Amino acid sequence: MKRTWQPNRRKRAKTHGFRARMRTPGGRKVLKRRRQKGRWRLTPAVR
Amino acid sequence: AVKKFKPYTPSRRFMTVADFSEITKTEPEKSLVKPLKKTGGRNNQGRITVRFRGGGHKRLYRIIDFKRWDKVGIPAKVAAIEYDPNRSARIALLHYVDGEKRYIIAPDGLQVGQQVVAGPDAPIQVGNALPLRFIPVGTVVHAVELEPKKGAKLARAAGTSAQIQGREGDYVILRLPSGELRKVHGECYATVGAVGNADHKNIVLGKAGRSRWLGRRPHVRGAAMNPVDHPHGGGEGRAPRGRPPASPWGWQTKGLKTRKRRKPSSRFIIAR
RNA sequence: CGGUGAAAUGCGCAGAUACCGGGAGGAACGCCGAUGGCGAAGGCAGCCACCUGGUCCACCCGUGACGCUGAGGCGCGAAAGCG
RNA sequence: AGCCUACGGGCAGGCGCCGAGGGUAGGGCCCGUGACUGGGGCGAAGUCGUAACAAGGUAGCUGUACCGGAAGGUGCGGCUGGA
RNA sequence: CGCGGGGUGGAGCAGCCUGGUAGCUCGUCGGGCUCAUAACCCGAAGGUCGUCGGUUCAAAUCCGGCCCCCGCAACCA
RNA sequence: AAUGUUCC
RNA sequence: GAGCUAGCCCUGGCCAGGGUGAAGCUGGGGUGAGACCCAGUGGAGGCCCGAACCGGUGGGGGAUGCAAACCCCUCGGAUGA
RNA sequence: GAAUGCCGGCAUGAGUAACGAUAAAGAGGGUGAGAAUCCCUCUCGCCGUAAGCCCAAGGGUUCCUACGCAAUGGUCGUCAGCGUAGGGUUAGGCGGGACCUAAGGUGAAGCCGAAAGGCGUAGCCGAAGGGCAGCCGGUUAAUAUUCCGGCCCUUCCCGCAGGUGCGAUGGGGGGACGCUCUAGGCUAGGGGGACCGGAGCCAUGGACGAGCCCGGCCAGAAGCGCAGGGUGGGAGGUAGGCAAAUCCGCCUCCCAACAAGCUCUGCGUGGUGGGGAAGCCCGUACGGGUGACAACCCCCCGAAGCCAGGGAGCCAAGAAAAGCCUCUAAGCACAACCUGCGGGAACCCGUACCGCAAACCGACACAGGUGGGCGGGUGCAAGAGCACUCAGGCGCGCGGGAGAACCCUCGCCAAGGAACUCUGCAAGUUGGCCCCGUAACUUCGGGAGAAGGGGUGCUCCCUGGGGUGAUGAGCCCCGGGGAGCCGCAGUGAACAGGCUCUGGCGACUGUUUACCAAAAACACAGCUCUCUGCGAACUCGUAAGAGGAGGUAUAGGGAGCGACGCUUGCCCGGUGCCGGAAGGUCAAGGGGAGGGGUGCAAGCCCCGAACCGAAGCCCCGGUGAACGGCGGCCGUAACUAUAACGGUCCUAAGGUAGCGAAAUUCCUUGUCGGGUAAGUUCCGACCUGCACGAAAAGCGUAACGACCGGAGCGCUGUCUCGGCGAGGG
RNA sequence: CGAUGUCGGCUCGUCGCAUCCUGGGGCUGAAGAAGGUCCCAAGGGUUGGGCUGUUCGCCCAUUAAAGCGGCACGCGAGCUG
Ligand SMILES: [Mg+2]
Ligand SMILES: [Mg+2]
Ligand SMILES: [Mg+2]
Ligand SMILES: [Mg+2]
Ligand SMILES: [Mg+2]
Ligand SMILES: [Mg+2]
Ligand SMILES: [Mg+2]
Ligand SMILES: [Mg+2]
Ligand SMILES: [Mg+2]
Ligand SMILES: [Mg+2]
Ligand SMILES: [Mg+2]
Ligand SMILES: [Mg+2]
Ligand SMILES: [Mg+2]
Ligand SMILES: [Mg+2]
Ligand SMILES: [Mg+2]
Ligand SMILES: [Mg+2]
Ligand SMILES: [Mg+2]
Ligand SMILES: [Mg+2]
Ligand SMILES: [Mg+2]
Ligand SMILES: [Mg+2]
Ligand SMILES: [Mg+2]
Ligand SMILES: [Mg+2]
Ligand SMILES: [Mg+2]
Ligand SMILES: [Mg+2]
Ligand SMILES: [Mg+2]
Ligand SMILES: [Mg+2]
Ligand SMILES: [Mg+2]
Ligand SMILES: [Mg+2]
Ligand SMILES: [Mg+2]
Ligand SMILES: [Mg+2]
Ligand SMILES: [Mg+2]
Ligand SMILES: [Mg+2]
Ligand SMILES: [Mg+2]
Ligand SMILES: [Mg+2]
Ligand SMILES: [Mg+2]
Ligand SMILES: [Mg+2]
Ligand SMILES: [Mg+2]
Ligand SMILES: [Mg+2]
Ligand SMILES: [Mg+2]
Ligand SMILES: [Mg+2]
Ligand SMILES: [Mg+2]
Ligand SMILES: [Mg+2]
Ligand SMILES: [Mg+2]
Ligand SMILES: [Mg+2]
Ligand SMILES: [Mg+2]
Ligand SMILES: [Mg+2]
Ligand SMILES: [Mg+2]
Ligand SMILES: [Mg+2]
Ligand SMILES: [Mg+2]
Ligand SMILES: [Mg+2]
Ligand SMILES: [Mg+2]
Ligand SMILES: [Mg+2]
Ligand SMILES: [Mg+2]
Ligand SMILES: [Mg+2]
Ligand SMILES: [Mg+2]
Ligand SMILES: [Mg+2]
Ligand SMILES: [Mg+2]
Ligand SMILES: [Mg+2]
Ligand SMILES: [Mg+2]
Ligand SMILES: [Mg+2]
Ligand SMILES: [Mg+2]
Ligand SMILES: [Mg+2]
Ligand SMILES: [Mg+2]
Ligand SMILES: [Mg+2]
Ligand SMILES: [Mg+2]
Ligand SMILES: [Mg+2]
Ligand SMILES: [Mg+2]
Ligand SMILES: [Mg+2]
Ligand SMILES: [Mg+2]
Ligand SMILES: [Mg+2]
Ligand SMILES: [Mg+2]
Ligand SMILES: [Mg+2]
Ligand SMILES: [Mg+2]
Ligand SMILES: [Mg+2]
Ligand SMILES: [Mg+2]
Ligand SMILES: [Mg+2]
Ligand SMILES: [Mg+2]
Ligand SMILES: [Mg+2]
Ligand SMILES: [Mg+2]
Ligand SMILES: [Mg+2]
Ligand SMILES: [Mg+2]
Ligand SMILES: [Mg+2]
Ligand SMILES: [Mg+2]
Ligand SMILES: [Mg+2]
Ligand SMILES: [Mg+2]
Ligand SMILES: [Mg+2]
Ligand SMILES: [Mg+2]
Ligand SMILES: [Mg+2]
Ligand SMILES: [Mg+2]
Ligand SMILES: [Mg+2]
Ligand SMILES: [Mg+2]
Ligand SMILES: [Mg+2]
Ligand SMILES: [Mg+2]
Ligand SMILES: [Mg+2]
Ligand SMILES: [Mg+2]
Ligand SMILES: [Mg+2]
Ligand SMILES: [Mg+2]
Ligand SMILES: [Mg+2]
Ligand SMILES: [Mg+2]
Ligand SMILES: [Mg+2]
Ligand SMILES: [Mg+2]
Ligand SMILES: [Mg+2]
Ligand SMILES: [Mg+2]
Ligand SMILES: [Mg+2]
Ligand SMILES: [Mg+2]
Ligand SMILES: [Mg+2]
Ligand SMILES: [Mg+2]
Ligand SMILES: [Mg+2]
Ligand SMILES: [Mg+2]
Ligand SMILES: [Mg+2]
Ligand SMILES: [Mg+2]
Ligand SMILES: [Mg+2]
Ligand SMILES: [Mg+2]
Ligand SMILES: [Mg+2]
Ligand SMILES: [Mg+2]
Ligand SMILES: [Mg+2]
Ligand SMILES: [Mg+2]
Ligand SMILES: [Mg+2]
Ligand SMILES: [Mg+2]
Ligand SMILES: [Mg+2]
Ligand SMILES: [Mg+2]
Ligand SMILES: [Mg+2]
Ligand SMILES: [Mg+2]
Ligand SMILES: [Mg+2]
Ligand SMILES: [Mg+2]
Ligand SMILES: [Mg+2]
Ligand SMILES: [Mg+2]
Ligand SMILES: [Mg+2]
Ligand SMILES: [Mg+2]
Ligand SMILES: [Mg+2]
Ligand SMILES: [Mg+2]
Ligand SMILES: [Mg+2]
Ligand SMILES: [Mg+2]
Ligand SMILES: [Mg+2]
Ligand SMILES: [Mg+2]
Ligand SMILES: [Mg+2]
Ligand SMILES: [Mg+2]
Ligand SMILES: [Mg+2]
Ligand SMILES: [Mg+2]
Ligand SMILES: [Mg+2]
Ligand SMILES: [Mg+2]
Ligand SMILES: [Mg+2]
Ligand SMILES: [Mg+2]
Ligand SMILES: [Mg+2]
Ligand SMILES: [Mg+2]
Ligand SMILES: [Mg+2]
Ligand SMILES: [Mg+2]
Ligand SMILES: [Mg+2]
Ligand SMILES: [Mg+2]
Ligand SMILES: [Mg+2]
Ligand SMILES: [Mg+2]
Ligand SMILES: [Mg+2]
Ligand SMILES: [Mg+2]
Ligand SMILES: [Mg+2]
Ligand SMILES: [Mg+2]
Ligand SMILES: [Mg+2]
Ligand SMILES: [Mg+2]
Ligand SMILES: [Mg+2]
Ligand SMILES: [Mg+2]
Ligand SMILES: [Mg+2]
Ligand SMILES: [Mg+2]
Ligand SMILES: [Mg+2]
Ligand SMILES: [Mg+2]
Ligand SMILES: [Mg+2]
Ligand SMILES: [Mg+2]
Ligand SMILES: [Mg+2]
Ligand SMILES: [Mg+2]
Ligand SMILES: [Mg+2]
Ligand SMILES: [Mg+2]
Ligand SMILES: [Mg+2]
Ligand SMILES: [Mg+2]
Ligand SMILES: [Mg+2]
Ligand SMILES: [Mg+2]
Ligand SMILES: [Mg+2]
Ligand SMILES: [Mg+2]
Ligand SMILES: [Mg+2]
Ligand SMILES: [Mg+2]
Ligand SMILES: [Mg+2]
Ligand SMILES: [Mg+2]
Ligand SMILES: [Mg+2]
Ligand SMILES: [Mg+2]
Ligand SMILES: [Mg+2]
Ligand SMILES: [Mg+2]
Ligand SMILES: [Mg+2]
Ligand SMILES: [Mg+2]
Ligand SMILES: [Mg+2]
Ligand SMILES: [Mg+2]
Ligand SMILES: [Mg+2]
Ligand SMILES: [Mg+2]
Ligand SMILES: [Mg+2]
Ligand SMILES: [Mg+2]
Ligand SMILES: [Mg+2]
Secondary structure, three states: OOOOOOOOHHHHHHHOOHHHHHHOHHHHHHHHHHHHHOOOOOOOOOO | OOEEOOOOOOOOOOOEEOOOOOOOOOOOOOOOOOOEEOOOOOEOOOOEOOOOEOOOOOOEEOOOOOOOOOOOOOEEEEEEEEOOOOOOOOEEEEEEOOOOEEEEEOOOOOOOOOEEEEOOOOOOOOOOEEEHHHOOOOOEEEOEEOOOOOOEEEOOOOOOOEEEEEEEOOEEEEEOOOOOEEEEEOOOEEEEOOOOOHHHHHOOOOOOHHHHHHOEOOOOOHHHOOOOOOOOOOOOOOOOOOOOOEOOOOOEOOOOOOOOOOOHHHHHEOOO
16 A cells, blocks of 8 residues: 655655754754764755 | 525435525625635644634635724715625625725615715614714614724624613613623714624524535534543443533533633623 | 411511612503494504505495305414424 | 148138236235224222312313323413303 | 341331430320211320340340341452 | 212 | 644646436416416436445455455445535 | 573575466577577467556666676576666757745744744745747657757847837736536547549459458648637716826716627638558668558547637635736936837756656565546447457566366356355345336335336338438438347347345434444534623633634534434432622731840840731522432222222432333343244333433434344255366465 | 463264163063163164254254263364354
């Protein structure tokens, strides 16, 4: 049947995107941990 | 003259539709200082507040002249009687002689092509508007303001009316549709005559979906719920409430008054 | 205080009954009024106005037997009752 | 495809429509019966009350509606078969 | 066989808790009113307190043991 | 302020 | 974290084909005027049968499966909540 | 040495199950070291409202070509969606952005919050919505509405030539809107044709013939023509459109009443341009040449699409903004705007490929899921159904044998026909269309497809309507009548209800436990109670604010009951709710009689009784469609039996109507009656209701039900009681 | 209790005898027939339906008889539910 993942470039960049992170003080801490750890991809890749 | 239906399918033996003969030949609405976009919404910024609103047919908000002191002494010709989905009452298109086109909430007995004017001069004929202090005692009236210069806010549902019972100083005493006796300031405007479409009480919605057409979602009783959701709920089958009857929030719903006691409007109220 | 044959229930020391002044609302219209009138029956009673029916008298003016009753039908139909 | 005495005929034979009745199914009317149940009539001396007839001890009767073991009581309106 | 409550004149109930004396209503009997009955009025009689024991000077009353009556309970797989 | 067995 | 799911807002789309024939019109009839009655027209409906679509009633299979909810037969709704 | 310990490796099961839909394969010839799997040909089978074609999302090189098989491929593999390398995606007109707004997000001013932050008119962002200028062919191995060819357009900028008071983010018009059913005329698509064009064929008994087979088209400015859609024209007066207006609106006179006239679409035709089968010949994976000076004509059906903003009916009353037209103000009128014609300028991104699937979501080449458009023909009444089939695409990435039990999926059966069993669970019967015919009941609609039947093919003859057509032929829809033929059998295959009687429950259509429960549960119109006079009541939030609602007692919130019919009796003693300027109690505070500690003293500092002190509670009342409750014992009648009646105790009051061994009943398979040969179930009664009962509603109720219970008929492998056959294992 | 699936039915049985029938025998208040009771005996057999989920039980129509029990109230890596 219909599974959980029904992808959308529109939704993924607005929910998890970089500009979505910086609006919240929560999301600013999200990147701040990911810079600290050393992620190559701070945000998920949208093309 | 309420239309009945032959019982050709079930829920049409009871289904009941109001008479539309008083609607003159004006089915499309006017524009240009007439409808705004009406935002349908069951809820505030976020969560639901008034539960079980939703659905419903799409509507356009006919903007209504509740404040008819704008055009004192200026007469009007009743152009048309139109349908309003936003209201129980009907609405009357008015062409002013001045040139404006506004709607007034259509009173009872008003016919097409009748002169109508607002102000202090304003002779006592159905549709005209006056201060309350200039209206004779005992006349039925509607669209009454509460405080002056704030808009018509009283007695404007279908077939409603307020009756003047007397004067006292700068205030007049009204018999409201609730039966409450209320002191209202004399300068508050008010439009004489009852509202009409009085047969709106006699409609029978017939089936379930006509409530969904109006925008009324299904309503779930408390005793059909579980006790997390409602006080009445739970219980192995059909418990008889076991407690004084309450809301989902705990406040009782059989006889509990909740008017704010220390309200400054208390000393203008005489009756229930 | 009410109330009865006499009482009691009840109402009242939180201000009752009896009084005056003001306000709301509903129903029925005293005297006139009668052994009266009107209507086919049921029935109809403060007053005003509108609409409207039956009826009686005078003049003997016109039609010219157009009349009487009425199975069914149709309409009215106190009070109580139903939506 | 038979038989015949006159053979562009008849008979035997075949086919078809109608057809008594039988079968299937569903209706109408009537009769008998049916656990139980409603009220009725009759039945020498059963039980409970007093409804009515004298203002029958609340005048009576009545249409309707409600109630009550029971007659009945009460309400609304009517009648004189009462003052 | 668990828990609680009850057995009182002929019928129905008190009085038990705080021991010393058993009362109310109907009924029964006698007499009044009536012509006679019922209603009503005046008198009166009637009770091993379920039994068996024992605590006390003393028991319907306090405590045990049986016999009946009423109510509750008798659940989990 | 209720009532009066059956037939004669 | 509402890209599954529940609800709602804004905007678009979809519903083969058959039936049943409500109101309303028009004509005739009827009456003092009506109510009303016949036809003919008309095409209403959380109407009917039934594909796409939406479901998941009963059974069978499947059970280290094609599948962490499937397949076959059957069945409900299908202009409406 | 053990902790169902951790990590790693290797065993056992075991050469076992499985190899992923039962749509199907066989042969010849190539290439190769190696072919059941790669290529070609021939034959067969499967899809064909797709298993074919075009988009959108998603995926990101998977597309094409060359070299190759270690690994992936459930086998093999020369093959590939795989490895290496090279190539390939071309836009003023397609889609998106230098245009607009909706929900929503953001947010100058402003409001709020310990901080973080939360609201918030205007503005801004925000799209399959609005607006906007391109159609047909041909080329590549891979792109094309993008390149090329033909034809046609749109913006700007600069010039000229002709016109006019021009001129705004401002006013107004317009854009601009539902559902259902429809009219007329077109088009897309399709069918036929003795007519036109065409290579070829006469087979096997017959036919050189109105013979067979294939094909008869697309686009196209101006101009015409055919259908439509839009809008009255003047003259005054004007206080409204937040300044003005010649525009809009309002009022009064005239002329039209129509589309007569302006426009604007659609469709034909149109200068012309392109395409152009079947067969044969070829050499490719795959395309080419000829057929071709190709023909390119006439009928008929005909849309859900177009003219579009068409019409009619109905209630639930059906977006905004910009583009566009007009009107004017600041400014200007050497400016500017409009029209025509020249020349010039016309940017950024996507463009391959799969796209109901082996390239998306499911760890997989997964029998699942995934939005839009085209989706041919014939026949079956119609149709997107069903069967066969064009175009097109596949035979599902393990096979060869054999023909045991057993299993799955099917097919048939004597005689009996539910005896099986919890239960006809399952399977069978019936099934489409047309025409007869159809009950109790009923809310007058229904029940109804009730039930129960009859016909259904082909040939010939006669005959009635329509439509396109000229009133005619033809072509196409509906019919009627009469003769006749064949088969066991005519919706001859496929798709296609078993029915009835009677209970319970729920009124009905609907909804739910994704993933064991679709129901008698939830919802539902409707009934009642209660709250709420607006800055409402209630909800969310600390607040601001917002929902309610741009609503106003015929409205909104909460609660129960759940159409409808007939009804909803008694108790306010306790709890709750409502009303009550008395009283009792009561906190902080007021007040300080008195008393205490210190000081030599004035003083400073503590406790502190009277009394005055709100809500709440006690107290007085009302309130049951508020929470709730609604008795026990004994006697009595002239056969017994029973009790209309009486006594007594208690309560706040002691279950009324209606129903009752029921979805309530323990004893209980209560006792009668019916159905049956036999009935713990069912149906109808009795009432001894352990323990119904009136809005946690009571008693009924036509219709409805994938609910639950009982019975009958029809029919059958459910069974007696098995047997045989087929395909996949 | 780091799991022993529990009623009833279906299929398959097998065993014990304190035997339902058939075989043999004693007594009988056994005339005969048909019975009663008791002993020996299990080799074989022990039906089909209605009701209930039923084991049991009650009936219908039969029969020579329509037996009682054990095997985890036999049997769910065999089925039903
Ligand atoms: Mg505008
Ligand atoms: Mg917001
Ligand atoms: Mg938010
Ligand atoms: Mg509800
Ligand atoms: Mg529940
Ligand atoms: Mg919750
Ligand atoms: Mg709670
Ligand atoms: Mg219960
Ligand atoms: Mg409760
Ligand atoms: Mg004369
Ligand atoms: Mg009357
Ligand atoms: Mg009356
Ligand atoms: Mg002859
Ligand atoms: Mg009879
Ligand atoms: Mg008397
Ligand atoms: Mg009397
Ligand atoms: Mg009397
Ligand atoms: Mg009385
Ligand atoms: Mg009287
Ligand atoms: Mg007198
Ligand atoms: Mg006692
Ligand atoms: Mg006692
Ligand atoms: Mg005596
Ligand atoms: Mg006496
Ligand atoms: Mg437990
Ligand atoms: Mg427990
Ligand atoms: Mg239990
Ligand atoms: Mg007597
Ligand atoms: Mg006597
Ligand atoms: Mg969602
Ligand atoms: Mg239809
Ligand atoms: Mg009609
Ligand atoms: Mg229809
Ligand atoms: Mg329907
Ligand atoms: Mg259907
Ligand atoms: Mg489709
Ligand atoms: Mg669902
Ligand atoms: Mg299923
Ligand atoms: Mg069906
Ligand atoms: Mg180890
Ligand atoms: Mg060790
Ligand atoms: Mg091994
Ligand atoms: Mg082997
Ligand atoms: Mg093995
Ligand atoms: Mg094996
Ligand atoms: Mg195998
Ligand atoms: Mg495979
Ligand atoms: Mg070779
Ligand atoms: Mg095929
Ligand atoms: Mg897209
Ligand atoms: Mg993409
Ligand atoms: Mg992938
Ligand atoms: Mg690659
Ligand atoms: Mg190669
Ligand atoms: Mg390989
Ligand atoms: Mg290599
Ligand atoms: Mg694989
Ligand atoms: Mg391999
Ligand atoms: Mg090779
Ligand atoms: Mg490739
Ligand atoms: Mg490659
Ligand atoms: Mg630019
Ligand atoms: Mg730019
Ligand atoms: Mg845009
Ligand atoms: Mg933009
Ligand atoms: Mg914008
Ligand atoms: Mg906005
Ligand atoms: Mg700040
Ligand atoms: Mg914000
Ligand atoms: Mg767009
Ligand atoms: Mg668009
Ligand atoms: Mg474009
Ligand atoms: Mg391509
Ligand atoms: Mg092209
Ligand atoms: Mg070009
Ligand atoms: Mg402009
Ligand atoms: Mg504008
Ligand atoms: Mg064409
Ligand atoms: Mg054509
Ligand atoms: Mg053709
Ligand atoms: Mg030819
Ligand atoms: Mg030949
Ligand atoms: Mg004009
Ligand atoms: Mg102005
Ligand atoms: Mg015209
Ligand atoms: Mg053309
Ligand atoms: Mg043209
Ligand atoms: Mg060619
Ligand atoms: Mg229109
Ligand atoms: Mg607008
Ligand atoms: Mg704007
Ligand atoms: Mg325009
Ligand atoms: Mg101008
Ligand atoms: Mg491309
Ligand atoms: Mg492409
Ligand atoms: Mg598709
Ligand atoms: Mg995949
Ligand atoms: Mg998976
Ligand atoms: Mg993959
Ligand atoms: Mg595969
Ligand atoms: Mg797949
Ligand atoms: Mg889906
Ligand atoms: Mg789909
Ligand atoms: Mg088609
Ligand atoms: Mg087709
Ligand atoms: Mg045929
Ligand atoms: Mg056809
Ligand atoms: Mg068909
Ligand atoms: Mg189609
Ligand atoms: Mg098909
Ligand atoms: Mg083919
Ligand atoms: Mg395979
Ligand atoms: Mg055969
Ligand atoms: Mg058979
Ligand atoms: Mg047979
Ligand atoms: Mg049979
Ligand atoms: Mg049976
Ligand atoms: Mg059996
Ligand atoms: Mg049974
Ligand atoms: Mg059954
Ligand atoms: Mg079945
Ligand atoms: Mg058949
Ligand atoms: Mg029925
Ligand atoms: Mg009918
Ligand atoms: Mg039939
Ligand atoms: Mg029926
Ligand atoms: Mg034939
Ligand atoms: Mg035509
Ligand atoms: Mg014609
Ligand atoms: Mg035949
Ligand atoms: Mg069939
Ligand atoms: Mg049934
Ligand atoms: Mg039923
Ligand atoms: Mg039952
Ligand atoms: Mg239901
Ligand atoms: Mg009911
Ligand atoms: Mg239905
Ligand atoms: Mg579930
Ligand atoms: Mg679950
Ligand atoms: Mg289910
Ligand atoms: Mg269901
Ligand atoms: Mg109701
Ligand atoms: Mg909030
Ligand atoms: Mg708060
Ligand atoms: Mg607000
Ligand atoms: Mg609002
Ligand atoms: Mg309400
Ligand atoms: Mg409400
Ligand atoms: Mg309910
Ligand atoms: Mg009825
Ligand atoms: Mg009640
Ligand atoms: Mg009470
Ligand atoms: Mg109370
Ligand atoms: Mg009280
Ligand atoms: Mg104090
Ligand atoms: Mg102090
Ligand atoms: Mg107080
Ligand atoms: Mg008594
Ligand atoms: Mg009572
Ligand atoms: Mg009973
Ligand atoms: Mg029987
Ligand atoms: Mg029986
Ligand atoms: Mg019964
Ligand atoms: Mg009970
Ligand atoms: Mg109940
Ligand atoms: Mg109740
Ligand atoms: Mg109910
Ligand atoms: Mg019932
Ligand atoms: Mg029923
Ligand atoms: Mg159902
Ligand atoms: Mg349903
Ligand atoms: Mg049976
Ligand atoms: Mg079998
Ligand atoms: Mg086989
Ligand atoms: Mg254990
Ligand atoms: Mg173990
Ligand atoms: Mg032995
Ligand atoms: Mg023997
Ligand atoms: Mg023997
Ligand atoms: Mg013998
Ligand atoms: Mg013997
Ligand atoms: Mg049976
Ligand atoms: Mg055994
Ligand atoms: Mg045992
Ligand atoms: Mg047992
Ligand atoms: Mg066992
Ligand atoms: Mg099992
Ligand atoms: Mg078992
Ligand atoms: Mg076992
Ligand atoms: Mg085992
Ligand atoms: Mg079960
Ligand atoms: Mg089951």
